[PDB]
Amino acid sequence: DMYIERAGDITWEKDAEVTGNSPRLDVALDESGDFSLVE
Amino acid sequence: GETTDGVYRVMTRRLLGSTQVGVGVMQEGVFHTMWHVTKGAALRSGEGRLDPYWGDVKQDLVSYCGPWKLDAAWDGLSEVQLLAVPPGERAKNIQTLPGIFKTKDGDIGAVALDYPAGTSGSPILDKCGRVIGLYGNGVVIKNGSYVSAITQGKRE
Numbered sequence A: 001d002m003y004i005e006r007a008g009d010i011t012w013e014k015d016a017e018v019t020g021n022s023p024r025l026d027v028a029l030d031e032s033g034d035f036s037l038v039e
Numbered sequence B: 001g002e003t004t005d006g007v008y009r010v011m012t013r014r015l016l017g018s019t020q021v022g023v024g025v026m027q028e029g030v031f032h033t034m035w036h037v038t039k040g041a042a043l044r045s046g047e048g049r050l051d052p053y054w055g056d057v058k059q060d061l062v063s064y065c066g067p068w069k070l071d072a073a074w075d076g077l078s079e080v081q082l083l084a085v086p087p088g089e090r091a092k093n094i095q096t097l098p099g100i101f102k103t104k105d106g107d108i109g110a111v112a113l114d115y116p117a118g119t120s121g122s123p124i125l126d127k128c129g130r131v132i133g134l135y136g137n138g139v140v141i142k143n144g145s146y147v148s149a150i151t152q153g154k155r156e
């Protein structure tokens, strides 16, 4: 049995840890809602 | 139960200790998460009950108490913030420029930020603080690193 606890407000935070890249990926989405790479 | 807007941990006790299986967003009295987190099961909010209302395994989305409310969209240009809520760790904004999932049915935002599976459901925000989608459905790439879709639902 599953329960929820509040974790914060939903706010844009000016001066937050900027990171990660921006890949363009060829993908397929199956009937189970699973993504996969089309190569 | 607690119907205050904001982001929430999704917990279970069905394993050793209290385990965080995912995250979700409360807006307009409706709780939004990813299908693979709850499997469409009901939720406790103190001693209030949340019953599923809408869901779709293919979109990997589920809403509780009401229809899907989150209609904001990535603009295709601006950076975004993942409001990550990892297991045992405080809420943390992580700003990023999304990549792109190219599919036969169209193009989708993707964010390349690796975090544990229990982070599934954390919202991704625009500059005005609107939820443009949820983190936690994606793919492991050439590198072995994780990339998530910006998964958004349709509003009616």
Ligand SMILES: Cc1cc(CO)c2cccc(CC(=O)N3CC[C@@H](CN)C3)c2n1
Pocket (backbone or CB within 6 Å): A032, A033, A034, A035, B036, B060, B114, B115, B116, B117, B118, B119, B120, B135, B136, B137, B138, B139, B146
């Ligand atoms: C293997 C892995 C690794 C990482 C990061 O290291 C993940 C981060 C967030 C979320 C998931 C889970 C995930 O993408 N799905 C499970 C179910 C499926 C169908 N919706 C999609 C991660 N799965």
